[PDB]
Symmetry: C2
Subunit: 139 residues, 2 copies
């Protein structure tokens, strides 16, 4: 459970946002890429796996199953690719910040920041960022 | 101490690697950018700050003091920029992996992965990755 992530794509202003969700915490990492490709996905996974425990990645379609680069990233980093499994919450915050940022990728990272640091209902308990640290700190 | 980072640049194959070190853990985040610019630095800081507690960033020269974008990122994210303060360890591991990766940026992230996951002397105690989680988990 500390190593379980969901991976999805979302789209805004004709760009692609790669989104990884730490399922138990709701903690997010996101990346704006020029184009959906195996290589970009592989790179994102390798960066995420260098930063957090990533044991298993769930995706909801076949696209990641067709990349030899994703396959090599999986084997390099020890990530199990499993089939079968926030995007709209993220687009809401991106909409709140879009006009403080010249570039979409800036607004996406401002949205990721707010998502990971905020408390639920704006008061009490832990943010997603505190929750992932607390889940991992308990080995 | 949980929020204290050092920020530096390093260079390989004519590219620029942005390196942030969590001073108490030795945990690293790194990014290959096309060009040293204020904007790229600001973006890197905002991404790091969305992911970890970043309270204070130490740098060892004036370059980050001259960017209005870095200034705006600092104020947006609540990061204190302080003057006054791993690169060679990272270039060693990059040298070990360079030939498993077509792109330098891939080799840099493979190096970051090994740096953050390895134990000191290859046995016992915590990796940098476990150390940063343990330091933050103790609020
Ligand atoms: C308040 C704040 C905080 C962080 C920020 O990061 C950026 C940026 C950037 C960037 C642009 C282009 C490339 C590229 O060429 O790929 C890379 C990075 C800004 C500028 C903006 O967006 O308002 C910014 C502002
Ligand atoms: C085993 C393994 C693990 C992860 C990996 O990521 C990549 C990649 C990539 C990339 C290239 C170009 C852009 C760009 O156009 O900016 C962005 C990302 C690879 C391919 C390589 O480098 O060997 C790779 C392999």
């Amino acid at each position: 459970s500390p190593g379980i992530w969901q991976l999805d794509c979302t789209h805004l202003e004709g760009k692609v946002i790669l989104v990884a969700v730490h399922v138990a915490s709701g903690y997010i990492e996101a990346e704006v890429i020029p184009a959906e490709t195996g290589q970009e996905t592989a790179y994102f996974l390798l960066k995420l796996a260098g930063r957090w425990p990533v044991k298993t990645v769930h995706t909801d379609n076949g696209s990641n199953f067709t990349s030899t680069t994703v396959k090599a990233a999986c084997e390099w980093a020890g990530i199990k690719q499993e089939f079968g499994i926030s995007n709209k919450e993220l687009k809401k915050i991106i909409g709140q910040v879009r006009d403080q940022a010249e570039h979409l990728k800036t607004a996406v990272q401002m949205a990721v920041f707010i998502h990971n640091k905020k408390r639920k209902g704006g008061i009490g308990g832990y943010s997603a960022g505190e929750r992932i640290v607390d889940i991992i700190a308990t080995d």
